[PDB]
Amino acid sequence: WGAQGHRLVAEVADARLNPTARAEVDRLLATEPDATLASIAPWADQLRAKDPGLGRRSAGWHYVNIAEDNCHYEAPKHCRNGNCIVEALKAQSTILGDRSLTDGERLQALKFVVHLVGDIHQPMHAGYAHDKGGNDFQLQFGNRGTNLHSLWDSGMLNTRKLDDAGYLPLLQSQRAPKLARQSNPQRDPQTWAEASCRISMQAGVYPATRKIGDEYTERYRPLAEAQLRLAGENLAQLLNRVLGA
Ligand SMILES: Nc1nc2c(ncn2[C@@H]2O[C@H](COP(=O)(O)O)[C@@H](O)[C@H]2O)c(=O)[nH]1
Ligand SMILES: [Zn+2]
Ligand SMILES: [Zn+2]
Ligand SMILES: [Zn+2]
């Protein structure tokens, strides 16, 4: 997602934290003055853009290319040295739950976890290696050029013309999605990446025309919006399991 999608995921999650997870999250956020779960949500993308060390090393952590294998993840194939969103979310969730570490180390893991639960729910973040998650699938959206990746990151969400204050209660108004009964931090990332990949492979997500507009938005913006709500609920359930006892 773009910055707004990330913040909306964190805002949905923040409301669902149990008292124990809320207390620990606020402790970690307190190490960095004026940080909120929303304000840290885009951080990993700024890290990627600005830090030629860890930013460059962590670029692969935002996605996984599994659509050519019909959305069946196998770690040695898509992720050799762990540089993909499935392995990175697993590792960062373990680091976040490690009470032996400093608040500063655990905050850094929280920033990655908040971002990557967001990204792992963006269908194009689990799509084709061939066109790099839709970046190389250029198209015309209204009277403006874009690509399939950007269209799902921010293009469709931007058509609402809402700030977070307008967009958040819209996501919260949706029918509650069916979550797993329990969070498993080590297994859920693969499940989530596979579910997101199946959406990238659904009839019409890749359009049959180069020009698209309202019809595409009308069909797929509600799916983008459902995935933001689902990401937020999944992120709260994960933080509640990892930090909430
Ligand atoms: N699924 C997928 N996403 C990619 C690929 N390369 C880059 N991305 C994603 O596409 C967006 C733009 O990529 P960037 O131009 O920053 O490398 C980011 O959200 C990034 O995670 C790729 O090979 N596969
Ligand atoms: Zn994103
Ligand atoms: Zn993206
Ligand atoms: Zn990202």
Numbering used by the authors: 27 to 271
The authors write:
Nucleases of the S1/P1 family have important applications in biotechnology and molecular biology. We have performed structural analyses of SmNuc1 nuclease from Stenotrophomonas maltophilia, including RNA cleavage product binding and mutagenesis in a newly discovered flexible Arg74‐motif, involved in substrate binding and product release and likely contributing to the high catalytic rate. The activity of SmNuc1 towards c‐di‐GMP in crystal resulted in a distinguished complex with the emerging product 5′‐GMP. This enzyme from an opportunistic pathogen relies on specific architecture enabling high performance under broad conditions, attractive for biotechnologies.
Purine nucleotide binding differs compared to pyrimidines, confirming the plasticity of the active site. The enzyme–product interactions indicate a gradual, stepwise product release.
